[PDB]
Paper text:
Mutations in MAPT, the microtubule-associated protein tau gene, give rise to cases of frontotemporal dementia and parkinsonism linked to chromosome 17 (FTDP-17) with abundant filamentous tau inclusions in brain cells. Missense mutations of residue P301, which are the most common MAPT mutations associated with FTDP-17, give rise to the assembly of mutant four-repeat tau into filamentous inclusions, in the absence of extracellular deposits. The other three isoforms lack exon 10 expression and have three repeats (3R). These repeats and adjoining sequences constitute the microtubule-binding domains of tau. Part of this sequence also forms the core of assembled tau in neurodegenerative diseases, indicating that the physiological function of microtubule binding and the pathological assembly into amyloid filaments are mutually exclusive.
We determined the structures of tau filaments from the cerebral cortex of five individuals belonging to three families with mutation P301L in MAPT. All cases had only tau filaments made of an identical single protofilament, with resolutions of 2.8–3.9 Å. Cryo-EM showed that the tau protofilament spans residues G271-T377 and adopts a double-layered, three-lobed fold. The cryo-EM density at residue 301 is consistent with a leucine side chain. Unlike the known structures of wild-type 4R tau filaments, which are folded into either three- or four-layered structures, the three-lobed fold of P301L tau consists of a stem of two-layered cross-β structure and two hairpin-like arms that are connected at a common junction. The short arm is made of residues 282–303, whereas the long arm comprises residues 304–342. The stem is composed of two segments made of residues 271–281 and 343–362, which are packed against each other. The C-terminal segment, which consists of residues 363–377 of tau, folds back onto the stem, from which it is separated by a non-proteinaceous density. With the exception of the short arm, the three-lobed fold of P301L tau resembles the Pick fold made of 3R tau, with the conformation of the long hairpin-like arm (residues 306–341) being nearly identical to that of the same region in the Pick tau fold. As no structure resembling that of the short arm is present in the known filament structures of wild-type tau, its formation is probably the result of the P301L mutation stabilising the local conformation at the R2-R3 junction.
Residue numbers in the entry:
A (entry chain C), B (entry chain A), C (entry chain B): 271 to 377
Amino acid sequence: GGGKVQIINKKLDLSNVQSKCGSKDNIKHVLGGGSVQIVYKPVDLSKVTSKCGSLGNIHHKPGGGQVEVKSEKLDFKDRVQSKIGSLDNITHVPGGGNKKIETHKLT
Amino acid sequence: GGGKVQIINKKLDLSNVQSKCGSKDNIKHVLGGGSVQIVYKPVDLSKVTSKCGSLGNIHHKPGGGQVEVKSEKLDFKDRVQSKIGSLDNITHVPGGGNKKIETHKLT
Amino acid sequence: GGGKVQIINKKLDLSNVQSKCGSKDNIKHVLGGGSVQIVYKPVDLSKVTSKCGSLGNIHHKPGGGQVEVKSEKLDFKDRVQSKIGSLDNITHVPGGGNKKIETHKLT
């Protein structure tokens, strides 16, 4: 019907939508924003088997992982100006819905 | 019906949509934004078997991984200006919906 | 019906859409934005077998991987100006919907 003005400003957003879905529909394992996920799952299956013999000393000292994530600066110096004159629904106005705008910006 | 004005400003966004989906439809394993995912899953299956013999010392010291991710600066100095005069739905106006605009910007 | 104005400004975005999909339709393993994914999955299956003999010392010290990702600067100094005069739906106006615009920019 009437006039619309839509301004949308998004930065680091994440949406996940499931509309009118049937069966076993899924949205999994999503990272958005400045997100960080770290999965540290080393598996050690090293085996030492000795049978009917001599074995010396065992020094089982595996290294661990190092993981480093760094983020230094986020700055949102954002402006949204929206200057609208009018959204007027004039209806059934005999004799007139006349507009007069006068502007004098002197400097 | 009436006039529309749509301004959309997106930067680092992530959307995932499933509309009118049937069965076993999926959206998996998505990274957006300035996202970081680190999966550290080393598997060690190194085996030492000795049978009917001599074996010396064992020094099982595998190195670990190093992972480094760095991000230094995000700056959003963004402007959106939207200057609209009018979105007027004049209807059924005998005698007139006359507009007069007068602007005097003197400097 | 009425006039439309659509301005879209996107930078580093990621969309994934599944509309009217049937069965087992999937969107997997997507990276967007300035995203970083690091999968560290070395597999060690090195084996040492000795039978009916002598073996000395074992020094199993494999090196780990090094992974380095660096990003230095993101700057969004972006402008969107949208200057629209009018989106007027005049209808059923006997005698006239006359417009008069007068502009005097003196400097």
